[PDB]
Amino acid sequence: SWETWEREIENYTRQIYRILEESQEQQDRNERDLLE
Amino acid sequence: SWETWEREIENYTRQIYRILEESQEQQDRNERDLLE
Amino acid sequence: SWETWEREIENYTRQIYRILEESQEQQDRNERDLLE
Amino acid sequence: SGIVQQQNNLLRAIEAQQHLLQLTVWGIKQLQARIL
Amino acid sequence: SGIVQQQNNLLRAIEAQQHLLQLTVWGIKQLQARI
Amino acid sequence: SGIVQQQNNLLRAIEAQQHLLQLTVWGIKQLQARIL
Secondary structure, three states: OHHHHHHHHHHHHHHHHHHHHHHHHHHHHHHHHOOO | OHHHHHHHHHHHHHHHHHHHHHHHHHHHHHHHHHHO | OHHHHHHHHHHHHHHHHHHHHHHHHHHHHHHHHHHO | OHHHHHHHHHHHHHHHHHHHHHHHHHHHHHHHHHHO | OHHHHHHHHHHHHHHHHHHHHHHHHHHHHHHHHHO | OHHHHHHHHHHHHHHHHHHHHHHHHHHHHHHHHHHO
16 A cells, blocks of 8 residues: 555656756756747 | 545546647647658 | 645745746737737 | 647646645645544 | 757656646545545 | 747746645655554
């Protein structure tokens, strides 16, 4: 029950953080490219 | 009131799954438009 | 800790509602600009 | 149209997820009152 | 392309958040049932 | 510009929602520790 729950919570949390970092880097690139 | 809560959870879950499906379809269309 | 949790829920909820409001204003502007 | 339409799709998804999040906060507050 | 790639990023974030949200719902129902 | 600015707003909303999700997980873990 809860052991698996805590594992899944940590797995998706780690994924989200990775995706948020990648998205912030893409945001930064898109905003820079705006001025080209 | 938990029964009502379950019903509102079900309803919004269905709404977001529909929105995610439309979003995936649109993402595919936008990527293919750019490639093609 | 629970009194602090309740205040942090409130703080982030308020922020999200302001960002969602600004995002909707931007959606509206972007759609109008597309048309012109 | 496709990029701006995808912005609207993602905005609606976040809005629906915010409704779901308010529902989970209500549910936790209901348990909190009883359990402590 | 940069905008579309960013949309793909945000869509995947929202999808992963939805899985997390359904895990929190499962957790609350488990505790509701106990109480 | 209006599209890139809009993506920054959607990114901010998702990030704030992630904060809220971690707060809801902390609350469920607290309640679970008190019950089981």
